[PDB]
Amino acid sequence: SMEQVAMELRLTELTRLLRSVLDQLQDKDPARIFAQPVSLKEVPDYLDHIKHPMDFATMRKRLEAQGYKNLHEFEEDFDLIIDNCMKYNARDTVFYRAAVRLRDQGGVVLRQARREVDSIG
């Protein structure tokens, strides 16, 4: 049907918007602390602490598989990157501090993406 293509044209354009958003969020992590998953060979106990690991490469695989149905799902994954870090790492660490910064700096980008998604459907 022609209805499923119109949707596929929107999902695709939602994918195009979220890709740009992801690039902008990742620019706020120049140390690349959140780039890749936490290594299980280097932190073997990680999963005893964190039940839903998240990172930018894992979000990118999902994104290119058009696996985000809306902005809220995308934001949930971003929030996990931050919240995981703030739990696992203590307050006086480079890692916790990098998450506080990414959160604060991402807020501006996610503000405008809510308006852009609403505005363009």
PDB file of C-alpha atoms in Angstrom:
ATOM      1  CA  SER A   1       0.000   0.000   0.000  1.00  0.00           C
ATOM      2  CA  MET A   2       0.656   3.718  -0.517  1.00  0.00           C
ATOM      3  CA  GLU A   3      -0.109   4.400   3.215  1.00  0.00           C
ATOM      4  CA  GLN A   4       2.850   2.204   4.391  1.00  0.00           C
ATOM      5  CA  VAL A   5       5.216   4.103   1.981  1.00  0.00           C
ATOM      6  CA  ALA A   6       4.082   7.551   3.346  1.00  0.00           C
ATOM      7  CA  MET A   7       4.946   6.243   6.863  1.00  0.00           C
ATOM      8  CA  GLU A   8       8.241   4.787   5.570  1.00  0.00           C
ATOM      9  CA  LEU A   9       8.937   8.306   4.120  1.00  0.00           C
ATOM     10  CA  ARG A  10       8.327   9.784   7.682  1.00  0.00           C
ATOM     11  CA  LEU A  11      10.181   7.030   9.676  1.00  0.00           C
ATOM     12  CA  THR A  12      13.013   7.654   7.218  1.00  0.00           C
ATOM     13  CA  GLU A  13      12.894  11.390   7.806  1.00  0.00           C
ATOM     14  CA  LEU A  14      12.659  10.796  11.557  1.00  0.00           C
ATOM     15  CA  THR A  15      15.769   8.671  11.097  1.00  0.00           C
ATOM     16  CA  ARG A  16      17.419  11.533   9.192  1.00  0.00           C
ATOM     17  CA  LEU A  17      16.568  14.033  12.001  1.00  0.00           C
ATOM     18  CA  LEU A  18      17.725  11.713  14.808  1.00  0.00           C
ATOM     19  CA  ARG A  19      21.052  11.056  13.008  1.00  0.00           C
ATOM     20  CA  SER A  20      21.837  14.792  13.076  1.00  0.00           C
ATOM     21  CA  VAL A  21      20.774  14.997  16.737  1.00  0.00           C
ATOM     22  CA  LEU A  22      23.010  12.020  17.565  1.00  0.00           C
ATOM     23  CA  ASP A  23      26.029  13.682  15.888  1.00  0.00           C
ATOM     24  CA  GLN A  24      25.424  16.857  17.913  1.00  0.00           C
ATOM     25  CA  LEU A  25      25.133  14.894  21.210  1.00  0.00           C
ATOM     26  CA  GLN A  26      28.280  12.953  20.483  1.00  0.00           C
ATOM     27  CA  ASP A  27      30.152  16.256  19.759  1.00  0.00           C
ATOM     28  CA  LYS A  28      29.607  17.047  23.436  1.00  0.00           C
ATOM     29  CA  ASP A  29      31.755  14.011  24.370  1.00  0.00           C
ATOM     30  CA  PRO A  30      35.144  14.909  22.768  1.00  0.00           C
ATOM     31  CA  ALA A  31      36.966  12.514  25.087  1.00  0.00           C
ATOM     32  CA  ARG A  32      34.846   9.698  23.573  1.00  0.00           C
ATOM     33  CA  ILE A  33      34.055   8.283  27.058  1.00  0.00           C
ATOM     34  CA  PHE A  34      30.527   7.271  25.872  1.00  0.00           C
ATOM     35  CA  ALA A  35      31.484   6.172  22.342  1.00  0.00           C
ATOM     36  CA  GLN A  36      31.576   2.432  22.818  1.00  0.00           C
ATOM     37  CA  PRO A  37      30.050  -0.031  25.266  1.00  0.00           C
ATOM     38  CA  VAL A  38      31.726  -0.544  28.658  1.00  0.00           C
ATOM     39  CA  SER A  39      34.112  -3.498  28.091  1.00  0.00           C
ATOM     40  CA  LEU A  40      33.062  -6.700  29.873  1.00  0.00           C
ATOM     41  CA  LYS A  41      36.626  -8.073  29.619  1.00  0.00           C
ATOM     42  CA  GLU A  42      37.835  -4.856  31.408  1.00  0.00           C
ATOM     43  CA  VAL A  43      34.851  -4.471  33.788  1.00  0.00           C
ATOM     44  CA  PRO A  44      33.734  -8.080  34.297  1.00  0.00           C
ATOM     45  CA  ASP A  45      31.225  -7.223  37.065  1.00  0.00           C
ATOM     46  CA  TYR A  46      29.539  -4.402  35.125  1.00  0.00           C
ATOM     47  CA  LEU A  47      26.257  -6.211  34.593  1.00  0.00           C
ATOM     48  CA  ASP A  48      25.911  -6.855  38.349  1.00  0.00           C
ATOM     49  CA  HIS A  49      25.709  -3.007  38.607  1.00  0.00           C
ATOM     50  CA  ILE A  50      24.037  -1.910  35.405  1.00  0.00           C
ATOM     51  CA  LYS A  51      21.105  -3.854  33.884  1.00  0.00           C
ATOM     52  CA  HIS A  52      20.677  -1.801  30.687  1.00  0.00           C
ATOM     53  CA  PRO A  53      24.050  -0.668  29.276  1.00  0.00           C
ATOM     54  CA  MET A  54      24.004   1.981  26.599  1.00  0.00           C
ATOM     55  CA  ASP A  55      26.531   3.906  24.450  1.00  0.00           C
ATOM     56  CA  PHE A  56      26.664   5.962  21.209  1.00  0.00           C
ATOM     57  CA  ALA A  57      27.708   3.106  18.845  1.00  0.00           C
ATOM     58  CA  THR A  58      24.848   0.915  20.115  1.00  0.00           C
ATOM     59  CA  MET A  59      22.403   3.844  19.579  1.00  0.00           C
ATOM     60  CA  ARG A  60      23.844   4.346  16.058  1.00  0.00           C
ATOM     61  CA  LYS A  61      23.260   0.647  15.125  1.00  0.00           C
ATOM     62  CA  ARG A  62      19.628   0.954  16.293  1.00  0.00           C
ATOM     63  CA  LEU A  63      19.209   4.306  14.524  1.00  0.00           C
ATOM     64  CA  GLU A  64      20.445   2.928  11.147  1.00  0.00           C
ATOM     65  CA  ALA A  65      18.098  -0.053  11.656  1.00  0.00           C
ATOM     66  CA  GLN A  66      15.218   2.530  11.924  1.00  0.00           C
ATOM     67  CA  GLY A  67      14.597   1.131  15.375  1.00  0.00           C
ATOM     68  CA  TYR A  68      13.558   4.428  17.037  1.00  0.00           C
ATOM     69  CA  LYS A  69       9.792   4.921  16.474  1.00  0.00           C
ATOM     70  CA  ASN A  70       9.880   8.430  18.063  1.00  0.00           C
ATOM     71  CA  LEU A  71      12.053  10.959  19.906  1.00  0.00           C
ATOM     72  CA  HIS A  72      11.077   9.587  23.378  1.00  0.00           C
ATOM     73  CA  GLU A  73      12.656   6.176  22.645  1.00  0.00           C
ATOM     74  CA  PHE A  74      15.797   7.974  21.438  1.00  0.00           C
ATOM     75  CA  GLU A  75      15.959  10.149  24.580  1.00  0.00           C
ATOM     76  CA  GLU A  76      15.518   7.101  26.813  1.00  0.00           C
ATOM     77  CA  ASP A  77      18.693   5.621  25.360  1.00  0.00           C
ATOM     78  CA  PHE A  78      20.580   8.893  25.881  1.00  0.00           C
ATOM     79  CA  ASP A  79      19.427   9.221  29.426  1.00  0.00           C
ATOM     80  CA  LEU A  80      20.692   5.643  30.038  1.00  0.00           C
ATOM     81  CA  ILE A  81      24.188   6.528  28.903  1.00  0.00           C
ATOM     82  CA  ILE A  82      24.175   9.317  31.522  1.00  0.00           C
ATOM     83  CA  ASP A  83      22.313   7.642  34.342  1.00  0.00           C
ATOM     84  CA  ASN A  84      24.437   4.467  34.103  1.00  0.00           C
ATOM     85  CA  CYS A  85      27.595   6.443  34.376  1.00  0.00           C
ATOM     86  CA  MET A  86      26.362   8.527  37.309  1.00  0.00           C
ATOM     87  CA  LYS A  87      25.505   5.320  39.190  1.00  0.00           C
ATOM     88  CA  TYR A  88      28.584   3.250  38.431  1.00  0.00           C
ATOM     89  CA  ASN A  89      31.129   6.015  38.892  1.00  0.00           C
ATOM     90  CA  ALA A  90      31.586   8.136  41.989  1.00  0.00           C
ATOM     91  CA  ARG A  91      31.070  11.890  41.985  1.00  0.00           C
ATOM     92  CA  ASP A  92      34.781  12.784  42.076  1.00  0.00           C
ATOM     93  CA  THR A  93      35.659  10.951  38.787  1.00  0.00           C
ATOM     94  CA  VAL A  94      36.358  12.129  35.304  1.00  0.00           C
ATOM     95  CA  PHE A  95      33.632   9.746  34.063  1.00  0.00           C
ATOM     96  CA  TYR A  96      30.808  11.044  36.356  1.00  0.00           C
ATOM     97  CA  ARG A  97      31.873  14.601  35.534  1.00  0.00           C
ATOM     98  CA  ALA A  98      31.801  13.947  31.784  1.00  0.00           C
ATOM     99  CA  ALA A  99      28.209  12.692  32.118  1.00  0.00           C
ATOM    100  CA  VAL A 100      27.086  15.797  34.008  1.00  0.00           C
ATOM    101  CA  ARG A 101      28.529  17.895  31.150  1.00  0.00           C
ATOM    102  CA  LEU A 102      26.987  15.793  28.372  1.00  0.00           C
ATOM    103  CA  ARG A 103      23.630  15.952  30.106  1.00  0.00           C
ATOM    104  CA  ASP A 104      23.740  19.760  30.513  1.00  0.00           C
ATOM    105  CA  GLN A 105      25.023  20.364  26.941  1.00  0.00           C
ATOM    106  CA  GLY A 106      22.659  17.804  25.375  1.00  0.00           C
ATOM    107  CA  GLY A 107      19.646  19.561  27.010  1.00  0.00           C
ATOM    108  CA  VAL A 108      19.914  22.447  24.518  1.00  0.00           C
ATOM    109  CA  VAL A 109      20.016  20.075  21.512  1.00  0.00           C
ATOM    110  CA  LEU A 110      17.098  17.938  22.774  1.00  0.00           C
ATOM    111  CA  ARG A 111      15.073  21.057  23.520  1.00  0.00           C
ATOM    112  CA  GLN A 112      15.205  22.090  19.867  1.00  0.00           C
ATOM    113  CA  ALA A 113      14.679  18.531  18.573  1.00  0.00           C
ATOM    114  CA  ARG A 114      11.366  18.298  20.477  1.00  0.00           C
ATOM    115  CA  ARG A 115      10.161  21.451  18.750  1.00  0.00           C
ATOM    116  CA  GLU A 116      11.483  20.270  15.289  1.00  0.00           C
ATOM    117  CA  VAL A 117       9.712  16.877  15.579  1.00  0.00           C
ATOM    118  CA  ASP A 118       6.396  18.491  16.708  1.00  0.00           C
ATOM    119  CA  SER A 119       6.715  21.241  14.055  1.00  0.00           C
ATOM    120  CA  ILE A 120       7.465  18.861  11.099  1.00  0.00           C
ATOM    121  CA  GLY A 121       5.423  15.864  12.444  1.00  0.00           C
TER     122      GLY A 121
END
